Amino acid sequence: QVVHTETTEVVLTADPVTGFGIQLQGSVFATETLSSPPLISYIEADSPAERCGVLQIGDRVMAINGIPTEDSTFEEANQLLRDSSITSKVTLEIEFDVAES
């Protein structure tokens, strides 16, 4: 159970069905804590994020498509996901903390 902590660059592509079944809450749309920054905490059983083979609940998004969000803006996160349609794909910079090997 080694302890780690790094940032990952997960580039996703808007699926022709749903697009981005993955949701990121800025500690506002969840009863668990609030007034906090935006992060990933929701994936679909058929979304590019789930099938990305490198995404899960816990990823701290703080630099998506350039926009690292300001303080806390849930609406901002959703906007970034929708702004991915422009290029058909987005690059979300997240931070993970390994705590189990």
- What domains are there in the chain, each with its CATH number? 1-101 (2.30.42.10)
> Quick one: which H or E segment has residue 95?
strand 89-96
Q: Radius of gyration of the chain from Cα atoms?
A: 13
Q: Residue 58: phi, psi to the nearest 5? A: 135, -25
Q: Residue 83: phi, psi to the nearest 5? A: -75, -5
Residue 4 tokens read as: 């780690």
CB 95, CB 77: distance < 8 Å: no
Determination approach: NMR
**Which amino acid, 86?**
I
